[PDB]
Amino acid sequence: LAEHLLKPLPADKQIETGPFLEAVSHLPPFFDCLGSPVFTPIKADISGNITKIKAVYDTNPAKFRTLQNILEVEKEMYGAEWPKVGATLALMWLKRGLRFIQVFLQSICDGERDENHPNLIRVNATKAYEMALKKYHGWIVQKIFQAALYAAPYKSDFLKALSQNVTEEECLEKIRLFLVNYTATIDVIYEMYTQMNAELNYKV
Ligand SMILES: CCCCCCCC
Numbered sequence: 421l422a423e424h425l426l427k428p429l430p431a432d433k434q435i436e437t438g439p440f441l442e443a444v445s446h447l448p449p450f451f452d453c454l455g456s457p458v459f460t461p462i463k464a465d466i467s468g469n470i471t472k473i474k475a476v477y478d479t480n481p482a483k484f485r486t487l488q489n490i491l492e493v494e495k496e497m498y499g500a501e502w503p504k505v506g507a508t509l510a511l512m513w514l515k516r517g518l519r520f521i522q523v524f525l526q527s528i529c530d531g532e533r534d535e536n537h538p539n540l541i542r543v544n545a546t547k548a549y550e551m552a553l554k555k556y557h558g559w560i561v562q563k564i565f566q567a568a569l570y571a572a573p574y575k576s577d578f579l580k581a582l583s584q585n586v587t588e589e590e591c592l593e594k595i596r597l598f599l600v601n602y603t604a605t606i607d608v609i610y611e612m613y614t615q616m617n618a619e620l621n622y623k624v
Pocket residue numbers: 441442444445448466467468470471474
């Protein structure tokens with residue numbers, strides 16, 4: 421995780437699109453290592469949105485230099501169909517997948533656990549779902565999440581998968597390092613959606 425740190429935010433809190441997409445493109449591969457085919461469509465969603473954004477960027481890298489540039493250009497370019505269109509829509513869902521990973525990792529690092537089932541990560545995933553995704557899912561998808569929860573690896577196994585021959589404590593310290601700029605970046609993205617009134621709450 422800490423081999424592909426996100427850059428700190430610059431003083432003007434503008435996120436450059438190219439470096440951002442390069443950075444987060446390192447996350448979907450972690451889903452191949454969780455030991456379940458349940459993760460294949462999850463990986464496709466997150467990668468699919470990165471791809472959607474990268475393809476808008478590639479048409480005009482200068483015009484789409486920053487994530488802010490994307491939202492403002494698309495607002496102008498699309499009129500009434502915006503923000504439910506283009507790279508704006510893909511980023512709206514990408515941020516929520518990114519926020520999920522953030523809350524989950526942070527929960528693990530903060531030592532939140534089920535006292536009764538200490539080596540499970542179900543409480544951490546459940547928190548992350550509630551905070552990042554749940555309100556945008558209808559009852560069917562929520563039910564699928566409840567089923568998929570059972571495919572979670574054991575905590576000890578998860579951390580081992582993210583790690584070199586390194587202790588669990590060492591692994592978590594590196595996860596903490598990653599979370600600094602990751603969290604900061606996602607926060608700026610969420611703030612941007614709020615300022616631009618680009619957030620939608622439709623359920624799927
Ligand atoms: C620089 C972004 C590349 C697009 C990859 C989509 C899969 C994670």
